[PDB]
Design a protein around this ligand. Structure first.
Ligand SMILES: NC(=S)c1ccc2c(c1)OCO2
Ligand SMILES: [Cl-]
Ligand code: NA
Lengths: 304, 300
């Protein structure tokens, strides 16, 4: 037993990380088959970053403008193109450590593992949720751009995130591996802020189930409720609307614990009014919203 | 910026995990060079749980009684010895993915990454601290025994923990890779219980230093404290005593932020008295004690 925030094992991704340099800028790249993926902002000087014309700045560059290093070994760049906000560097060598992989775009509320990297060197791994406001609450310093987020399904890595920038509030923004931003953000030095965030309701409920399953039961009660009554409380507390699809995805946990969702909503309802004033559920004084139902079942069943 | 419970990248350890079977019991082993390390209790049957005589159980085993599997490949065992509570299976192949590694015993307060594994297959990775009562608060199900705890400093893997059991309170007990238990625990199913746990004060202070580095100042105060008055107060909340060692260790974070260690102690004394009054620190509503002074500097 026990319940921890757990990343996927990062080894299939560690084998793909490289250093990419263009002028004075070094950041990370993702080496899959014979292509290196990195943020297009690698091409920009500080002056360019204010109002970049990526079309123009890139035709001006050539293959030899890009240094790619896999450990101590230089990769030869034999071509370059841009897809949305991602740069694709064609290299002369297929990565012999390329895993079974897909590029996937994740939905807000879904979780993934971040492999934080510096100078092409894996530094740490942690779990994030894609927030409703399309930011992530990561831990990133200068040099971390090009660090990726992923899930693992059996032996298949699903790459879903590439790190691009920090916003003024200290939260993080990036693209999918096709270079489409999550959220209404641009890759330039201009005024940009995160939207007011909201709490991921179905994940909070998942985590209350995780708590019950681990012998934390104090918050529970005899009552129940309606989607309609709860949602009016949720909107008041800046929680996402709970939908029939959400209630359905929590099915296994309602079953395993004997506590129905609108049962737990009643518990959750009661918790929103009052505050848990330093009091604790699974070692937290906050209502945790970065575990998905799948995260709770996966962890409380030992999937490998 | 940002601050997260961050595990070491697990790849170097992933390439070392195998499946050991003895009798009807399967658990994880660690394959370094020509040796597979696993908990000795893999040789116990139903009766051998309360009072196993491991010397007598092991002498009755031949190499062929141990089924070791690395992915699809069966590894052939050619030798066995016991060291303390760890079984060492000599095999006919050296692991070609063996990283640069060492075995280190940690002290209470130290942090490490756990690679949770089932049937020799890694499941996930997370950060733990060795608690002051010599337990860890992990996430471990049946089949997780032989999962390991590690640090990776400058390309060398330091193994510090191998998982043996869950105690009745739902906390976890294990050994170093020399097979010595952390704390008073034994590899018997006789009733055992952890000491009252306490908070790792030096780590809470390191985390308040992280908060200040990341631009939080709301919890600071105009007061200071003597070390002794700090300990007389902190022990009333089941905090570990802070030693001069701890004060020395926080010197670098003190210098970077310009807040003296005993001034930060006065903020912690106030937070214990007041709580957070609806505020958070680095996204927590609790005082966090599983980041070391070293983890704070690594991450900031
Ligand atoms: N003979 C012991 S102490 C033992 C045997 C098997 C075990 C275990 C402990 O924890 C889960 O699996
Ligand atoms: Cl130590
Ligand atoms: Na209820």
């Amino acid at each position: 037993s026990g319940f921890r925030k757990m990343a996927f094992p990062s080894g299939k991704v560690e084998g793909c990380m490289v250093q990419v340099t263009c002028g004075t800028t070094t950041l990370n790249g993702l080496w899959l088959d014979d292509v290196v993926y990195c943020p297009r902002h690698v091409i920009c000087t500080s002056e360019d970053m204010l109002n970049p014309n990526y079309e123009d700045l890139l035709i001006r560059k050539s293959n030899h403008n890009f240094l790619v290093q896999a450990g101590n070994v230089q990769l030869r760049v034999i071509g370059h193109s841009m897809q949305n906000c991602v740069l694709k560097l064609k290299v002369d060598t297929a990565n012999p450590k390329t895993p079974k992989y897909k590029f996937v775009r994740i939905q807000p509320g879904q979780t993934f593992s971040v492999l934080a990297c510096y100078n092409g060197s894996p530094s740490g791994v942690y779990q994030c949720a894609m927030r409703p406001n399309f930011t992530i609450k990561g831990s990133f310093l200068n040099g971390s751009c090009g660090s990726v987020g992923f899930n693992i399904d059996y032996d298949c890595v699903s790459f879903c995130y590439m790190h691009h920038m920090e916003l003024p509030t200290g939260v993080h923004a990036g693209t999918d591996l096709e270079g489409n931003f999550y959220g209404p953000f641009v890759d330039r030095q201009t005024a940009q802020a995160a939207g007011t965030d909201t709490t991921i309701t179905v994940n909070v409920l998942a985590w209350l189930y995780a708590a019950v399953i681990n012998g934390d039961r104090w918050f529970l009660n005899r009552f129940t409720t309606t989607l309609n009554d709860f949602n009016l409380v949720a909107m008041k507390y800046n929680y996402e609307p709970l939908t029939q699809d959400h209630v359905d995805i929590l099915g296994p946990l309602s079953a395993q614990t004997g506590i129905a969702v609108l049962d737990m909503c009643a518990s959750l309802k009661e918790l929103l009014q009052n505050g848990m004033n330093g009091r604790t559920i699974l070692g937290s004084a906050l209502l945790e919203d970065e575990f998905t139902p799948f995260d709770v079942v996966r962890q409380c069943s030992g999937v490998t």
